[PDB]
From Swiss-Prot:
Phosphorylated upon activation of the receptor-type kinase FLT3. Phosphorylated upon activation of the receptor-type kinase PDGFRA. Phosphorylated by activated PDGFRB. Interacts with phosphorylated LIME1 and BCAR3. Interacts with SHB and INPP5D/SHIP1. Interacts with MILR1 (tyrosine-phosphorylated). Interacts with FLT1 (tyrosine-phosphorylated), FLT3 (tyrosine-phosphorylated), FLT4 (tyrosine-phosphorylated), KIT and GRB2. Interacts with PDGFRA (tyrosine phosphorylated). Interacts (via SH2 domain) with TEK/TIE2 (tyrosine phosphorylated). Interacts with PTPNS1 and CD84. Interacts with phosphorylated SIT1 and MPZL1. Interacts with FCRL4, FCRL6 and ANKHD1. Interacts with KIR2DL1; the interaction is enhanced by ARRB2. Interacts with GAB2. It comes from Homo sapiens (Human). Its EC number is 3.1.3.48. The modification N-acetylthreonine is found at T1. Changing P453S: In NS1; increased phosphatase activity. Acts downstream of various receptor and cytoplasmic protein tyrosine kinases to participate in the signal transduction from the cell surface to the nucleus. Positively regulates MAPK signal transduction pathway. Dephosphorylates GAB1, ARHGAP35 and EGFR. Dephosphorylates ROCK2 at 'Tyr-722' resulting in stimulation of its RhoA binding activity. Dephosphorylates CDC73. Dephosphorylates SOX9 on tyrosine residues, leading to inactivate SOX9 and promote ossification. Dephosphorylates tyrosine-phosphorylated NEDD9/CAS-L. This is Tyrosine-protein phosphatase non-receptor type 11.
Amino acid sequence: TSRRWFHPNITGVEAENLLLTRGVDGSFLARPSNPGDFTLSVRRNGAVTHIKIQNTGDYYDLYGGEKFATLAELVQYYMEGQLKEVIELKYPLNCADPTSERWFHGHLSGKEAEKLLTEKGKHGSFLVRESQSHPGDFVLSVRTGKSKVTHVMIRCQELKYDVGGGERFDSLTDLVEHYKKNPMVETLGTVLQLKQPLNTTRINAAEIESRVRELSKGFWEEFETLQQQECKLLYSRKEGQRQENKNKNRCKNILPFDHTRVVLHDGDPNEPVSDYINANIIMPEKKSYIATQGCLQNTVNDFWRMVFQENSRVIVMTTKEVERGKSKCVKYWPDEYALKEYGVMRVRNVKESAAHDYTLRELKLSKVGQGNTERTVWQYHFRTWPDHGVPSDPGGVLDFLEEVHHKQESIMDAGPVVVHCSAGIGRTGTFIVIDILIDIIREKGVDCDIDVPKTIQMVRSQRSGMVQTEAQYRFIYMAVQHYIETLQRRIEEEQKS
């Protein structure tokens, strides 16, 4: 609901002073860091303790704690155990910095704000900018509708914010949220409804190169604004929390949303719960996906029940079975030319074809004792993804996804494309997002509208924390840039031949 406990522009010593002067025992905050890392600063017995959170691209790993899909899910978990050599998360210490808010521009001038609200904004579209010049003060610009752009002055008096009367707010967020729920009425009756903020992320696919360079001059700020929206995605994950489902999860707290989870049918009456798999259907809002985790040895049979039931013909594997001496995915496919039975399912590995970045396994899947149920399942196993971070060049990933798209398109009545890595959120999220965005450019051509964080947010509403890091976020932009460049180069070559 809030995510006010995250402070994007704070330092170690600044966080300590804040918890000692504005907080009590049990007070906490989360802060970025040596980048790529995060810190949970908690006050206990008049002393401040710092707990390290690392994310290399798979999940948020809290030291002495658990692995989580989002910082918001991490916070919700401990607020609803953390120990030393007992750390309690009781009171979130709220941030007043509005820089990660969608509606906050600041830098914008009166003329520019009006221009953007006219061309991009609609009824209820609003923004907050800095004055302009009554230094320290802020300006709320709102569109209502013939239409009109209304300006409301926000005075900053002794650290508090107000619209000239009534209540005095600790932050611009407290002020905005109050006027969103309780709208301001003008002298002649016009209701200043704050429906949605101004979209500053939607770009034309052809103009990617310019946006990539402007973000390279921005990438971190755009990601954190998207990150600030995860508190709206804390949907129930009850099924995964069930006692009988606990050992079917690779990470106990990285669970599928109940509303999008894959439900397994025709199981076994002897096992009480046979309908669960840590997987979700990803529907872009034609080509759908199943975002899943790497198999555990006790879920390989459920994995095959899923593929068969969902009528999937393409498996996208974005991890090695072993990375840094740790099992990331149990081998669920047989050896080349071998035939294996996985419970009620039978799988034949027909042929293996190796490319530079991946291996293709041609599998034949059927139900045991059931003639005619056989279908070919193509497993594209990407092998070169780095242990930490993302690849330097997206050429290999793009060549891989083009090949995956062509195979999926070549199959009549094919079900969702199964996509998995380790926990099935970071790399899995990255691959599905690139594939969705490239799908738009494939149908609509080089000149179409794309919105990278809007797409990520839609995918994160279907499976927890899809796209884990800023590295992946930037890599998504770099892959879309490389695809448009490669598409234009093909037009260059044809007209010149």
